[PDB]
Amino acid sequence: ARVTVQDAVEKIGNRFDLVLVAARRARQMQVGGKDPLVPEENDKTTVIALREIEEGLINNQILDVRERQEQQEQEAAELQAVTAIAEGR
Amino acid sequence: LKAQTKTEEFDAIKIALASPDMIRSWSFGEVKKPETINYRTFKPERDGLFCARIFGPVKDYECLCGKYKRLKHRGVICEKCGVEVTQTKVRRERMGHIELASPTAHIWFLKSLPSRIGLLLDMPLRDIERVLYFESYVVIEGGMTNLERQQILTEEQYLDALEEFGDEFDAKMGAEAIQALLKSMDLEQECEQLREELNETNSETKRKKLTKRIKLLEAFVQSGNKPEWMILTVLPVLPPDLRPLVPLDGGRFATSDLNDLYRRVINRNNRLKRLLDLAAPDIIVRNEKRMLQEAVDALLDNGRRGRAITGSNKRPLKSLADMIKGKQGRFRQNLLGKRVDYSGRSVITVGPYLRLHQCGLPKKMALELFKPFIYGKLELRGLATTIKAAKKMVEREEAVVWDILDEVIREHPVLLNRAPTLHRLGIQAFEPVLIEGKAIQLHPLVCAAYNADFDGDQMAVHVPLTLEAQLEARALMMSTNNILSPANGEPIIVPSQDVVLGLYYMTRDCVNAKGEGMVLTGPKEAERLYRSGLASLHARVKVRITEYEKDANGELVAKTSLKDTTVGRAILWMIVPKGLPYSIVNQALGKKAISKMLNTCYRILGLKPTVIFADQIMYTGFAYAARSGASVGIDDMVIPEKKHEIISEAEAEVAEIQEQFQSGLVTAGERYNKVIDIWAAANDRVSKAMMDNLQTETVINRDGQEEKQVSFNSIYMMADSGARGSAAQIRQLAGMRGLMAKPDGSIIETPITANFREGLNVLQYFISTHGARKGLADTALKTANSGYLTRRLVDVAQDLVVTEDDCGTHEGIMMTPVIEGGDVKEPLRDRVLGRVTAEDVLKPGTADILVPRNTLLHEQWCDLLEENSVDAVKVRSVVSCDTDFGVCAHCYGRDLARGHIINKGEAIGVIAAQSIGEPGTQLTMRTFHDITGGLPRVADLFEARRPKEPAILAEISGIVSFGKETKGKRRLVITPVDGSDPYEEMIPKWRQLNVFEGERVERGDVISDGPEAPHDILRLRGVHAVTRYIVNEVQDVYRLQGVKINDKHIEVIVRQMLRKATIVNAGSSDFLEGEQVEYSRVKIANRELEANGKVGATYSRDLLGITKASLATESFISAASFQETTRVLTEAAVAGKRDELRGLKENVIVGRLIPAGTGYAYHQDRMRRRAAG
Amino acid sequence: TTDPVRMYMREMGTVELLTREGEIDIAKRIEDGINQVQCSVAEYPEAITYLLEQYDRVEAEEARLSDLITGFVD
Amino acid sequence: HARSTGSYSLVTQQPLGGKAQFGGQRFGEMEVWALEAYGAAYTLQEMLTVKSDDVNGRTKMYKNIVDGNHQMEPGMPESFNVLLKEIRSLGINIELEDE
Amino acid sequence: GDDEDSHLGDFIEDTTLELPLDSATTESLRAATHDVLAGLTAREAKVLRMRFGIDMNTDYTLEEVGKQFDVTRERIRQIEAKALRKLRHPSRSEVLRSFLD
Amino acid sequence: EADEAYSVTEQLTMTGINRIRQKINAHGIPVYLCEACGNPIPEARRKIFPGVTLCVECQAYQERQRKHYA
Amino acid sequence: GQNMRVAFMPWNGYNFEDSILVSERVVQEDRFTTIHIQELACVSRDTKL
Ligand SMILES: [Mg+2]
Ligand SMILES: [Zn+2]
Ligand SMILES: [Zn+2]
Ligand SMILES: [Zn+2]
């Protein structure tokens, strides 16, 4: 999806929401939070995200869903720890 | 939950008056001395305009005296000198104050055009100014005596008035008096007074002036301000570093002009404090006061006095007001515009080897531009120990870095921008390709959009820094994403000149040449035949081709045929992608036919295939252009064999009309216009003579006898193809070059009989001079004129954004072909393409739904329409859209560089203006042609200017007649059958009337002739009528000039023209006020089923000219950008106006996300968080 | 009019210049005026004893001779 | 000419030619309408915030750039910060409301 | 010149400012010093961090440092020199060296 | 660039001349009585100008009068 | 200036608008090579320090 973006513009209609959704994805990867869901051709995270929009593995729904999942993945680890803030009682 | 305190990301902004106690809240010490710095140890003197105790340390985190120099000590106020040690930033943030002895009038609320201090007391200005310089005493709360509360007395009068009533009546003079009036004055009390007088005395002379005050008062009450505050007790001082005293080289100093001003104010104030303890005579303490009132005014806004000059320097010194104001408004937001990091420029050159999505960027430039990126990637991969090493590495230009730069360059767009940024295509995003050389290489197809030639023009580069900016520049600004003009859905990336001359020569045929008549298996072997010199490029040939047509249900059908073509056209088909027909390349391919080809490719295969196709077109056209060896020599410009004949004939025609003039058969002015025709004719004979000779006279033979065909002469191929030059310009090379005219316009009676292939002689050139010089002169000014028109249009649009998806209104405008007298000056298909239907369209027969309600009319629909005899269609337009505060996606249309419907958030107001304002360069600013037609004719339209001698229209239906007589104006009386008759308007009977005097006339008929004012058409004929008047009469000028601007744009401007309305009933609004139909439309809905019917209210749409419409803006920050700044703030500060941002202009000012495009998401998501919990 | 230079000139133009004698007419009232308070000050009991305590401060080295008097009548 | 990061004007913390490594290109009004016609909301902010006027933002950015994090922590342009003070030093109380 | 709204003050550059390339390296000089002092012995870190103002207010006289360890005097004066000596040659020397211009 | 300046000139020149040209019309045919004042129209004016309605006297006069007010 | 052998024809687009296409023989012949003289000055001043 380097030359034209048209194929991603179909998967999200706005053409604007694309830029924002693809960015929120690109930062998950550039700031090495995650690893790509599609073969990285030494393309930077700009296009690597855009490739994922075309192939249909990343959209606003998924990211909000994937985000909301980690919120509870990390909540579980701290569970036995943040509970030890019974010092307030 | 807890609110907040410290620096949040603010929204909304408030402006107001400053309480004297309020100014003290900001101050961190009173500046008490006119001292600056020491004269030896250039330290700041405590405590004066520059000071550490009050404002801040002279060097970072270091006490002034030097006791505490350790960076650990911060919150320390040194026991020596009261100097807290923090950043020097606070010498740019911290304010201070001066306490004034006597009150002093704030020159803005006293002298901004409508004096605020004036009409708040209902007191004249020349009287107030009289009180201030102690010319006369003025009463204050005159009590039960002899004197009005605001009456003014003279010295000799006040004394005599005093002898009678000692106390129980008081008068003062000077600033203290005004301050007393405002303090004592009760608005609430005076508000009740003004309410009775309105209803009691019924007068249009009286209650028109009365009402204008009462609303102005209760504004100031509900504001929050206190009238006393317009008289200054406390005066703030501007942080030192914003008016600095920095050193220069050679040891000489430089300083701001505010310093001379602020100094003089401090001195005169101090010298007055002294005079009060010396008990000086009134004649002096007055004079001192007068000087302070002057020095304050020269500080605030110098120029509303006598213009205080700077020390020893003739120039006047720049005041606070002069520091905000400018040309136009705030300098900072005006172009330019702020310099910007990560940028550069140089000369641009070509590079046909580019793909359309890239550009040639000098090695040297890319190194300096991406410097932080290289420092990063270098230490990321471990090639540098630390950033300081990376600095030295790229400084050393070690060869290792080049390989790094190519990494950081790859998927990282840059922005290219060329000189006058006219439409959004003036900035475009490319992928950078490293270049040895110091010039930028610019893909040739984009040259059209930039209006770039290569006579040495330079372009700028910009690096998208943030991740957002890369994806913004890649999905919106990239070259390949914007190939369609936003003005007219047609491709703007059409092949320019060299490249089209290429294809033309290629897909062209001659009568007999190598390869004549053979047959070949397919395109592949047609090239094989040519490259080896066996076949001629242009020879008539049957070849097997396989074309495709996706005519199935979205499915590709293949067709193979032995098509009758030429070798050239065969080879070319190897480019054309899939679903196009072989018919499209079977022709001759001129510039005209070559762009329609690109168009159909877009509307059938989509963006992606068109882009890569368009590249191949350029690459191939260039290649074969070189092979062709087309050139131009002297012998190419073939003169007609008959030229000298044609001259002597029209030369004898003047000799006929001459004989007749001398013999008085014809008159003198007659003879001039006679000769000018017989010359003007001969030029048309010489022109279409050579053009018959030049066009076809290559006469060549095929096996049999003789034959003739379109010429292959070099200079012809250029014009016929459309690569450059037209039979018009050619007419000056071979045939004679017209008659010229001096700047006057009065065309000279002895034409240029010579042409350019011949010499011109002395006189002929000298005559050619005038037209040439005025030509350059004109287009020099035509540069300024384009710029101003587009600027006004965005000021009145701008803030308009697509907001809703579908407002759900069934209303719209009726689209028909334009049919301007002759035949079909513009087709119906064009007017309706990309627009959405108001209501379902029926066949000529009915029960038959062709297009069902609102469907986006793309290319198929437009033909299924044109298949039947469909004659007119109603379409939703921006002028009709029920959505308030914006435009719903449906009512707009589709247009973009992309072919789908306009997206939510796209900022269509701006893009409308640009599209209209860009071609303004191609329109004439003269006048052309009783009727007019040119670029100022456009502005006159957008400005709603009523014309010189208007026509007048039937104000109501019914039978008319004349009454009374010739009193400068003869009364015309319309009388309807049912309704009231009362309309009698007095018409000047010395303009020719057209009304039949005893006939019934439909309201909105022509009662005289001549142009009519758009203000009428809206009022008498309807919102949809006036909107149709503008769009057709403006498009007439553009369409006369060959400029395509889809009505869509002109319509959005029209919307902003009738943003406002005036009321006619009552209940909850002001009966007569003018306001946006938006606020009404929402609020008659908020009364039709809400509170009371109240009543009401009915309104009336009002046509505002663009310049006047833009002048009214909700955001006061926006207004201070382009309006007069002094007035805007003053008018706004008394009102306590709150700006919520919301618009575009202001958010750019304050440097946050534009409330459109990508930001629309954020602003929308944040605006709802407001007015909530 | 406006600009202060004019309206000062006019404000002081009313007051008429003194005669050779009229200079002393006002000069005399000045002496009379000051003298009246000089006699009003001399009459005050606390004003007397104060100058005693303040002089007793100068001989005990708690002031200086310059701090209190500027010479006498002689 | 080309400039990554260079000199900044004292009065306005704005890219300025000082050592002939010349000031960056000026991005005037018309070039802003260009970005406004696209959706280029961030490209515009960065253009007249961290790339120029934001005394705090520019360094926060450059540090982020070399850390390999493409972001912006913008805040407020000093050009507007001076207007607030310039207005506030007239008799006008100009505040930033709310939250 | 030009009469244009180019004014003298518009060219007066700021000299008190700290250009990022330097603000960059300073944020990175802390990094190198910190890692160099942890890759030392914990006593040589407390000793060196103390002789210089390194993440502490003021810096301390070498005697002040001795009493704080109970083994005092000439003792501390040698630990310093060896710690510097340690950070002097390579593996260690490489990184800090590059900060010099 | 600059080319357009030339282009501009040509369009202007053409328009001015054209207006002038039209002010002569074409194949006309009619009578001989002057519409203003009835004076004899000679066939010379009829054959030089097809459709002439103003005698040589009036074809000056009016022209002359317009000049005066300029 | 210096005159040279010039031939009018499209050369694969390397003269698209008014751009010019030049043979190496010219830069090798140092013939449109141009000699420039800049004046750079150093000043010893007196500052407060
Ligand atoms: Mg040019
Ligand atoms: Zn101190
Ligand atoms: Zn709508
Ligand atoms: Zn006559």
PDB file of C-alpha atoms in Angstrom, chain E residues 3-91:
ATOM      1  CA  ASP E   3      11.108  49.591   3.977  1.00  0.00           C
ATOM      2  CA  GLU E   4       9.489  46.192   4.479  1.00  0.00           C
ATOM      3  CA  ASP E   5       8.108  45.077   7.838  1.00  0.00           C
ATOM      4  CA  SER E   6      11.473  43.507   8.311  1.00  0.00           C
ATOM      5  CA  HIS E   7      12.678  45.435  11.362  1.00  0.00           C
ATOM      6  CA  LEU E   8      16.007  45.449  13.188  1.00  0.00           C
ATOM      7  CA  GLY E   9      14.627  43.554  16.177  1.00  0.00           C
ATOM      8  CA  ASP E  10      13.478  40.749  13.910  1.00  0.00           C
ATOM      9  CA  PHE E  11      17.117  39.736  13.312  1.00  0.00           C
ATOM     10  CA  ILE E  12      18.405  39.932  16.899  1.00  0.00           C
ATOM     11  CA  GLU E  13      19.029  36.298  17.642  1.00  0.00           C
ATOM     12  CA  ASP E  14      18.682  34.708  21.050  1.00  0.00           C
ATOM     13  CA  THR E  15      22.053  33.797  22.533  1.00  0.00           C
ATOM     14  CA  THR E  16      20.857  32.527  25.917  1.00  0.00           C
ATOM     15  CA  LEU E  17      18.999  29.645  24.258  1.00  0.00           C
ATOM     16  CA  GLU E  18      20.307  26.090  24.293  1.00  0.00           C
ATOM     17  CA  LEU E  19      20.207  24.505  20.858  1.00  0.00           C
ATOM     18  CA  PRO E  20      18.780  20.964  20.838  1.00  0.00           C
ATOM     19  CA  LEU E  21      21.970  19.261  19.563  1.00  0.00           C
ATOM     20  CA  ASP E  22      23.455  20.316  22.929  1.00  0.00           C
ATOM     21  CA  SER E  23      20.301  19.771  24.969  1.00  0.00           C
ATOM     22  CA  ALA E  24      20.308  16.376  23.261  1.00  0.00           C
ATOM     23  CA  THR E  25      23.844  15.399  24.290  1.00  0.00           C
ATOM     24  CA  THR E  26      23.373  16.636  27.857  1.00  0.00           C
ATOM     25  CA  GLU E  27      20.421  14.284  28.332  1.00  0.00           C
ATOM     26  CA  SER E  28      22.765  11.605  26.955  1.00  0.00           C
ATOM     27  CA  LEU E  29      25.850  12.587  28.968  1.00  0.00           C
ATOM     28  CA  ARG E  30      23.926  11.759  32.148  1.00  0.00           C
ATOM     29  CA  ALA E  31      23.160   8.358  30.642  1.00  0.00           C
ATOM     30  CA  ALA E  32      26.805   7.521  29.988  1.00  0.00           C
ATOM     31  CA  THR E  33      28.059   8.766  33.351  1.00  0.00           C
ATOM     32  CA  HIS E  34      25.327   6.826  35.143  1.00  0.00           C
ATOM     33  CA  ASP E  35      26.160   3.553  33.388  1.00  0.00           C
ATOM     34  CA  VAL E  36      29.890   4.125  33.861  1.00  0.00           C
ATOM     35  CA  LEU E  37      29.396   4.551  37.616  1.00  0.00           C
ATOM     36  CA  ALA E  38      27.292   1.410  38.019  1.00  0.00           C
ATOM     37  CA  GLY E  39      29.776  -0.681  36.016  1.00  0.00           C
ATOM     38  CA  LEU E  40      32.213   0.330  38.736  1.00  0.00           C
ATOM     39  CA  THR E  41      32.406  -0.883  42.308  1.00  0.00           C
ATOM     40  CA  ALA E  42      29.620   0.426  44.518  1.00  0.00           C
ATOM     41  CA  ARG E  43      32.173   2.236  46.693  1.00  0.00           C
ATOM     42  CA  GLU E  44      33.843   3.916  43.721  1.00  0.00           C
ATOM     43  CA  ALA E  45      30.405   5.123  42.610  1.00  0.00           C
ATOM     44  CA  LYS E  46      29.507   6.687  45.970  1.00  0.00           C
ATOM     45  CA  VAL E  47      33.055   8.065  46.096  1.00  0.00           C
ATOM     46  CA  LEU E  48      32.979   9.587  42.619  1.00  0.00           C
ATOM     47  CA  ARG E  49      29.364  10.801  42.716  1.00  0.00           C
ATOM     48  CA  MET E  50      30.426  12.646  45.894  1.00  0.00           C
ATOM     49  CA  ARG E  51      33.620  14.353  44.728  1.00  0.00           C
ATOM     50  CA  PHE E  52      31.583  15.910  41.901  1.00  0.00           C
ATOM     51  CA  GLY E  53      28.124  17.421  42.080  1.00  0.00           C
ATOM     52  CA  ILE E  54      26.759  14.259  40.464  1.00  0.00           C
ATOM     53  CA  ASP E  55      23.075  13.763  41.396  1.00  0.00           C
ATOM     54  CA  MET E  56      23.645  15.527  44.752  1.00  0.00           C
ATOM     55  CA  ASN E  57      23.519  19.088  45.985  1.00  0.00           C
ATOM     56  CA  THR E  58      26.963  20.661  46.457  1.00  0.00           C
ATOM     57  CA  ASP E  59      30.135  18.600  46.153  1.00  0.00           C
ATOM     58  CA  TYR E  60      32.195  17.436  49.091  1.00  0.00           C
ATOM     59  CA  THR E  61      35.746  17.966  50.290  1.00  0.00           C
ATOM     60  CA  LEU E  62      37.674  14.702  49.985  1.00  0.00           C
ATOM     61  CA  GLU E  63      38.004  14.644  53.792  1.00  0.00           C
ATOM     62  CA  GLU E  64      34.235  14.996  54.191  1.00  0.00           C
ATOM     63  CA  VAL E  65      33.964  11.805  52.107  1.00  0.00           C
ATOM     64  CA  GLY E  66      36.461   9.905  54.287  1.00  0.00           C
ATOM     65  CA  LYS E  67      34.636  10.276  57.607  1.00  0.00           C
ATOM     66  CA  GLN E  68      31.416   9.024  55.950  1.00  0.00           C
ATOM     67  CA  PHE E  69      33.162   5.675  55.322  1.00  0.00           C
ATOM     68  CA  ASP E  70      35.076   5.340  58.658  1.00  0.00           C
ATOM     69  CA  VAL E  71      38.163   4.459  56.618  1.00  0.00           C
ATOM     70  CA  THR E  72      39.434   7.930  55.932  1.00  0.00           C
ATOM     71  CA  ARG E  73      42.089  10.166  54.389  1.00  0.00           C
ATOM     72  CA  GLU E  74      44.744   9.052  51.867  1.00  0.00           C
ATOM     73  CA  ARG E  75      42.534   5.973  51.454  1.00  0.00           C
ATOM     74  CA  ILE E  76      39.741   7.869  49.651  1.00  0.00           C
ATOM     75  CA  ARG E  77      42.277   9.894  47.632  1.00  0.00           C
ATOM     76  CA  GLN E  78      43.501   6.687  45.962  1.00  0.00           C
ATOM     77  CA  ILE E  79      40.073   5.121  45.260  1.00  0.00           C
ATOM     78  CA  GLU E  80      39.243   8.246  43.232  1.00  0.00           C
ATOM     79  CA  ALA E  81      42.381   8.100  41.075  1.00  0.00           C
ATOM     80  CA  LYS E  82      41.911   4.391  40.376  1.00  0.00           C
ATOM     81  CA  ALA E  83      38.236   4.891  39.502  1.00  0.00           C
ATOM     82  CA  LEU E  84      39.201   7.612  37.022  1.00  0.00           C
ATOM     83  CA  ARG E  85      42.028   5.326  35.869  1.00  0.00           C
ATOM     84  CA  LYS E  86      39.418   2.603  35.380  1.00  0.00           C
ATOM     85  CA  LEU E  87      37.140   4.826  33.248  1.00  0.00           C
ATOM     86  CA  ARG E  88      40.290   5.970  31.408  1.00  0.00           C
ATOM     87  CA  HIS E  89      41.007   3.072  29.093  1.00  0.00           C
ATOM     88  CA  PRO E  90      38.865   1.237  26.608  1.00  0.00           C
ATOM     89  CA  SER E  91      35.723  -0.766  26.784  1.00  0.00           C
TER      90      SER E  91
END
